[PDB]
């Protein structure tokens, strides 16, 4: 256990969790005429 005196410090770490000419004209070409 004498090696416990040689245990390195824990590293710090982190993430960054921040999130990041009409259909009418075409339709009108299909309108039928009727009396």
């Amino acid at each position: 256990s004498s090696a416990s005196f040689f245990r390195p410090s824990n590293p710090t770490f982190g993430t960054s969790i921040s999130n990041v000419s009409s259909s009418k004209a075409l339709l009108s070409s299909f309108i039928a005429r009727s009396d």
């Binding site: 410090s9 590293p11 770490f13 982190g14 993430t15």
Partner: protein
């Protein structure tokens, strides 16, 4: 011939109804008559009628963003599968519009809307790519969808599009990939999809947004041990690219590159490599910046780097000592203060060879001042650093002349076992094998019951270790061969009774 027969009767009625709906200046398009007309056209074998519905869907959703039914999404998802580019653009625009709604983000993916989007991204039409990748990024905003996007196979098209020459496409693809780095499982899927080489090469990107997204994504990826292992094995250029980004004209990019190096600084091999790649001169400048974020990132990263014993000499040579001490003036940033003290402790623990310049830095006096008016986490770091410093016989008297006992004695009163125990251990080592007890004698009954009160208090402690420290300290004094020191113990009834009972 040439299609002598006209359009179907039910499709002619749908055309006239829909045109009237779109001309009205009022109307719920997502429920009844309008929806039935749109669906009829989306079922026609006339491509022009399908274009009319896709165009109408896009215009309607651009002006009416609501939570919709499956019956609204089904015809749109059908149109997404068209071979017709105009139908694909409009239908995807519509789905992208609806996907700004939160509830729609869930229903779209639940209905398999991720499938058509993935294939469109693999196509060659840049406009459909753009609307599809934008709809994908928009869907990924909800954490429920992120894992299934990560496993749908969509990271492959996102990786391909991250290499696109159209900056709209490239920004959205890298932004989406960045959205997939918030969980270890998602980072794993993205690593397995081959996106790491692309992210690394794009650290060189000329667009600030793109290189910010990829720097941030690599930093998150580097948070996992398994990913650091693969990065070390397949990305030799990573550290030099990140070091170069510490010169970026954008503080945002400089900060994220430093955070990435900090994460990659968790492994001993990267702690050395970052030094070998020239990172120290950048960090010693960044910890002196006035940008709080820049200081937080750089002090955290040098703290990780200083864990490595073979880096102590180069860190002192790079001039970190005085700037680290100045960081203790951030009395409102516990995180900065702890990281700075922890860095100093790492350097003191690695080697005694620069202990002289350590003292000339003002580190001892500044830690002495913070010891009592700082948070407990800072107290924990300072007391541990004092305990480390008190080990070297060569600097014990220098520490005592600096009146370190004025900090250590009050700290032994702390309710935090870390602060009290570290300070007790430091005190015990300072009483051991020194050849001048002037300062010990001066502190016998001086600041906070000096040493006498410390021995009496720790002799009573329920903590076997704390009692042992007191008994071992008393033996150090009895072994001092100082007649005055020995009499302080041997002629004190209260210390004698504390020892016996």
């Amino acid at each position: 011939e040439a299609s002598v027969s006209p359009i179907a009767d039910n499709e002619r009625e749908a055309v006239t109804l829909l045109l009237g709906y779109l001309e009205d200046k009022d109307l719920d398009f997502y429920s009844g008559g309008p929806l039935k007309a749109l669906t009829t056209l989306v079922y026609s074998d006339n491509l022009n009628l399908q274009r009319s519905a896709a165009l109408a869907f896009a215009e309607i959703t651009e002006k009416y963003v609501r939570q919709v039914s499956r019956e609204v999404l089904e015809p749109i998802l059908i149109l997404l599968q068209s071979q017709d580019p105009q139908i694909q653009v409009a239908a995807c625009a519509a789905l992208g519009n609806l996907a700004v709604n939160n509830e729609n983000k869930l229903l779209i993916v639940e209905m398999g809307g991720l499938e058509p989007l993935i294939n469109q991204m693999m196509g060659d039409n840049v406009e459909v790519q753009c609307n599809a990748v934008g709809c994908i990024t928009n869907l990924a905003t909800r954490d429920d969808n992120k894992h299934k996007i990560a496993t749908s196979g969509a990271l492959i098209p996102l990786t391909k599009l991250a290499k696109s020459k159209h900056i709209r496409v490239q920004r959205n693809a890298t932004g989406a990939l960045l959205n997939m780095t918030h969980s270890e499982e998602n980072r794993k899927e993205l690593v397995n999809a081959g996106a790491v080489p692309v992210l690394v090469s794009l650290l060189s990107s000329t667009d600030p947004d793109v290189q910010y997204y990829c720097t941030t994504a690599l930093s998150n990826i580097a948070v996992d041990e398994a990913n650091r292992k693969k990065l070390a094995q397949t990305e030799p250029r990573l550290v030099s690219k990140l070091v170069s980004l510490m010169d970026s004209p954008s503080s945002r990019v400089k900060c994220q590159a430093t955070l990435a190096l900090r994460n990659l600084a968790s492994d001993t091999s990267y702690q050395l490599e970052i030094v070998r790649a020239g990172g120290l001169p950048h960090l010693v400048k960044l910890i002196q910046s006035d940008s709080i974020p820049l200081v937080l990132a750089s002090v955290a990263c040098i703290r990780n780097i200083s864990i490595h014993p073979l880096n102590e000499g180069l860190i002192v040579d790079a001039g970190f000592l005085k700037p680290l001490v100045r960081l203790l003036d951030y009395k409102d940033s516990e995180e900065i203060q702890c990281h700075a003290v922890s860095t100093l402790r790492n350097l003191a623990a690695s080697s005694e060879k620069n202990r002289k310049e350590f003292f000339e830095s003002g580190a001892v006096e500044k830690c002495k001042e913070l010891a009592l008016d700082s948070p407990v986490s800072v107290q924990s770091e300072i007391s541990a650093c004092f305990a480390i410093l008190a080990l070297a016989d060569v600097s014990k008297l220098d520490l005592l002349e600096a009146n370190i006992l004025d900090a250590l004695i009050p700290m032994t009163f702390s309710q935090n076992q870390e602060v009290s125990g570290n300070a007790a251990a430091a005190l015990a080592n300072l009483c051991s094998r020194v050849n001048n007890y002037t300062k010990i004698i001066e502190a016998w009954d001086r600041p906070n019951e000096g040493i006498r009160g410390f021995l009496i208090r720790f002799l009573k402690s329920d903590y076997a270790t704390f009692e042992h420290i007191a008994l071992w300290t008393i033996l150090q004094l009895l072994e001092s061969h100082n007649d005055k020191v020995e009499d302080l113990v041997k002629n004190d009834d209260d210390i004698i009774n504390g020892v016996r009972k």
